[PDB]
Amino acid sequence: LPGAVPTESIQGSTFEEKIFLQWREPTQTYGVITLYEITYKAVSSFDPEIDLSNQSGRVSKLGNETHFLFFGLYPGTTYSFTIRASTAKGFGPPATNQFTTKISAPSMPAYELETPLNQTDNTVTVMLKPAHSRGAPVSVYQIVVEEERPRRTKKTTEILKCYPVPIHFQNASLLNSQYYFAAEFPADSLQAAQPFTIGDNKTYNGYWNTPLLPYKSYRIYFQAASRANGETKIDCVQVATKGG
Ligand SMILES: *[C@@H]1O[C@H](CO[C@@H]2O[C@@H](C)[C@@H](O)[C@@H](O)[C@@H]2O)[C@@H](O[C@@H]2O[C@H](CO)[C@@H](O[C@@H]3O[C@H](CO)[C@@H](O)[C@H](O)[C@@H]3O)[C@H](O)[C@H]2NC(C)=O)[C@H](O)[C@H]1NC(C)=O
């Protein structure tokens, strides 16, 4: 029977849903290694919403090549790996270490550009719903109001992307940004579906929520962010349009 893999050789390069785990063979060969058997057990997570008991599993990595790409993992989560080496006559002792998947952006609610709850010359009111954590808690919500320039083509030069750079309304004209952040909430607001009024003129976390100009065409996105380990990740979804 073979020795164990040296615990200190086990290293992992980690992603949102994958961990590439890598090690070195046991210190001296009793006999040829035929497979490594690996258990991964979900240890802990920054996500408040998932039950980890079902997230564990086993890998019988056939063959004696010393790495494996773990797949389908859950983000923001620490997995403990136990590696056993096997001579054809049986396993060596286990060695074990743990690594953590990186967090991912929260998953927004589904929107279909339903006609808003009410609309005026200066305001639009829409029903917001809480986003779900996927790897880390939702930290803040942000609301993006974006002006439409006149266009002569549908086509885009590049992929559609969200808004990581916040901008207060009063600075957009100076900075020539196409959008402004109308509001930000701590995510303890919007724990259940409740309407929100674009342009209600009140200030949320330092963002003024400027009323809209009726001769301007606008589209509004609802965005959410999650934070851990200095990585902070966002997603956004368009909730309404206005023109006049
Ligand atoms: C990892 O595995 C390789 C592959 O060996 C093959 O796969 C194993 C999982 C077992 O099923 C083995 O029974 C099987 O041979 C080992 O490397 C080298 O593989 C070659 C090809 O099979 C072996 O070749 C033979 O060796 C004999 C003796 O020298 C010659 O007379 C033959 O002509 C033939 O070429 C070779 O033995 C094998 N090398 C060694 C040192 O065993 C590899 O060693 C193994 N490593 C570990 C750490 O497990």
- Structure-solving method: X-ray
Ligand 1, atom 9, residue with closest C-alpha: 34
Instruction: Find out whether 63 and 35 touch, Cβ atoms under 8 Å.
Output: yes
Q: Which of 32, 34, 61, 66 to mutate to test the pocket of ligand 1 (most atoms within 8 A of CB)?
A: 32
Between CA 222 and CA 107 the distance in angstroms is 11
Q: Which domain holds residue 15?
A: 7-101
- Owner of token pair 């930290």: 139
Q: Is the CB of 120 under 6 A from ligand 1?
A: no
Ligand 1, atom 43, residue with closest C-alpha: 32
List, edge to edge, every strand of the sheet that includes 194-198: 118-119, 124-128, 194-198
- Owner of token pair 């490594």: 36
Phi-psi region of 107 (alpha: psi -120 to 50; beta: other; left: phi over 0): beta
Query: 11-34: b or e for each residue (b if 16 or more CB lie within 10 Å)?
Result: ebebebbbbebebebbeeeeeebe
Which CATH number do you get for residue 79?
2.60.40.10
What Cα–Cα distance (Å) separates residue 27 from each residue in 42, 71, 172, 193, 229?
A: 28, 28, 62, 58, 35
List, edge to edge, every strand of the sheet that includes 19-22: 11-14, 19-22, 67-70
Q: Is the CB of 33 under 6 A from ligand 1?
A: yes
